[PDB]
């Protein structure tokens, strides 16, 4: 995974993403959805998706949520308040937490100021609590700023290492981006129906046909503008669309 | 369980030298940091040195340096504090703690061991 | 390095709540650190309590009943300690505590604190 004062930001893009292999995985200790309830994430479509990833303890995994204080929300990754996405965390202890300490897992003490919401801040000057100006050298109120966690495999829970993954969907003024599957039923034949043909939405008889389309037209009209063909998406081949018996 | 043992107190005149020992016993003994905190009789705490797991950062306190010595030998599951040139006021009760860092606080203490430096 | 001025001597009677106070220097946003804190019996080693900064992120002690609770004034440059139900096994000596940079680990000065039998 990425530090927690340097997390990664994955954009995921024009895609099919399905959120039901996260939502009931059952792997995850913590799955929150802020902007959008989980169940519905699997029929909304939006412009770009981020994801964030890094490591934290245990028991910080409640500053990452919008509006919250602490050493991580404040000066490592801050959440705007009208945040939309979800907050996905699980424990990792057997995978980052190594006998004598891992300590390559940092995190930043000390800023200036509180992080701008999906700021993010790299640097390692010499912080400077006291008036007295530091000079580049440590001291008395001049503190180098990044810590580190020494995860060991032997300590109580809510130290162990946990990873997190934060998706946040994003919506500027594009045309449109990835969204959740679109699932099928059969298709029959023969029987007055009600039918949907990715957009095209109608009733009638289907049948099978014996024209021939070119190569990139979906549906066939009649003079007078009616929808009378259509093409199967799945198979590629053209059904007559008849109504159904009326008198 | 875990529990640490020192020795090495007594009663030395100024200008001479001493050394401690804490022993530990229980957990795994090179897995973790180690400090030397002492207090005098009658007054409050004060840390004077650390040792990381042999990690080399003996980081002394600002009226230890050039006087103190720490050291460690995990074959024997031993910490040692080497003092010399004791300034007749170095006098208190010493402790070994054990530094648990990511949570970032001391725990499992060893009792102390005074020394007193008369003349 | 900072000096945590503690006021001595303390005192309050069982059932009643005591507030101690552990207060840096004129400089540092004690809004900026998290406070540690020990207490210590006669005869006998230290022990941890707590530490507190920023509420929702709190952390307790393995063994420290919720009696004992921190928390931290802005503009005193304070942090406070609250025992909350005083019993016959408070006397002790209770030290604030700061660690800042793995390089110094800076005590309090030590405050007494006695339940009026």
């Known amino acids: 995974f990425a530090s927690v004062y340097a997390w990664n930001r994955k954009r995921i893009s024009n895609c099919v993403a399905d959120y039901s292999v996260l939502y009931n995985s059952a792997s995850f200790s913590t799955f929150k959805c802020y902007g959008v309830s989980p169940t519905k994430l699997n029929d909304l479509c939006f412009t770009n998706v981020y994801a964030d990833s890094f490591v934290i303890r245990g028991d910080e995994v409640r500053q990452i949520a919008p509006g919250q204080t602490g050493k991580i929300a404040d000066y490592n990754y801050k959440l705007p308040d009208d945040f939309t996405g979800c907050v996905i965390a699980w424990n990792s202890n057997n995978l980052d937490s190594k006998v004598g300490g891992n300590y390559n897992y940092l995190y930043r003490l000390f800023r200036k100021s509180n992080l701008k919401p999906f700021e993010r801040d790299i640097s390692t000057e010499i912080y400077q609590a006291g008036s007295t100006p530091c000079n580049g050298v440590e001291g008395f109120n001049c503190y180098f700023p990044l810590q580190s966690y020494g995860f060991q495999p032997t300590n109580g829970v809510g130290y162990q290492p946990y990873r997190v993954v934060v998706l946040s969907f994003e919506l500027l003024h594009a045309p449109a981006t990835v969204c959740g599957p679109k699932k099928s039923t059969n298709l029959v034949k023969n029987k007055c129906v009600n039918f949907n043909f990715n957009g095209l939405t109608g009733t009638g008889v289907l049948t099978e046909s014996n024209k021939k389309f070119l190569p990139f037209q979906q549906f066939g009209r009649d003079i007078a503008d009616t929808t009378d063909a259509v093409r199967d998406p799945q198979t590629l081949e053209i059904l007559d669309i008849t109504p159904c018996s009326f008198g | 369980q875990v529990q640490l043992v020192e020795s090495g107190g007594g009663v030395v005149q100024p200008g001479r030298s001493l050394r401690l020992s804490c022993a530990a016993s229980?957990?795994?003994?090179?897995?973790?940091?180690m400090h030397w905190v002492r207090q005098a009789p009658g007054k409050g705490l004060e840390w004077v040195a650390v040792?990381?797991?042999?990690?080399?950062?003996?980081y002394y306190a600002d009226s230890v340096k050039g006087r103190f010595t720490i050291s460690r030998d995990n074959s024997k599951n031993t910490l040692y504090l080497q003092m010399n040139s004791l300034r007749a006021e170095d006098t208190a009760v010493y402790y070994c703690?054990?530094?648990?860092?990511?949570?970032?606080?001391?725990?499992?203490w060893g009792q102390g061991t005074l020394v007193t430096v008369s003349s | 390095q900072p000096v945590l001025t503690q006021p001595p001597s303390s005192s309050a009677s069982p059932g009643e709540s005591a507030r101690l106070t552990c207060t840096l220097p004129s400089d540092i946003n004690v809004s900026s650190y998290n406070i540690y804190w020990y207490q210590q019996k006669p005869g006998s080693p230290p022990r941890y309590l707590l530490y507190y900064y920023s509420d929702s992120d709190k952390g307790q002690g393995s063994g420290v009943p919720s009696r004992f609770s921190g928390s931290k004034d802005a503009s005193a440059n304070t942090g406070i300690l609250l025992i909350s139900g005083l019993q016959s096994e408070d006397e002790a000596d209770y030290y604030c505590?700061?660690?800042?940079?793995?390089?110094?680990?800076?005590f309090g000065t030590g405050t007494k604190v006695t339940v009026l039998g």
């Open positions: 703690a054990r530094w648990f860092h990511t949570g970032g606080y001391f725990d499992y």
């Open positions: 505590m700061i660690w800042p940079s793995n390089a110094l680990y800076v």
């Open positions: 040792i990381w797991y042999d990690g080399s950062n003996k």
């Open positions: 229980g957990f795994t003994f090179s897995s973790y940091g």
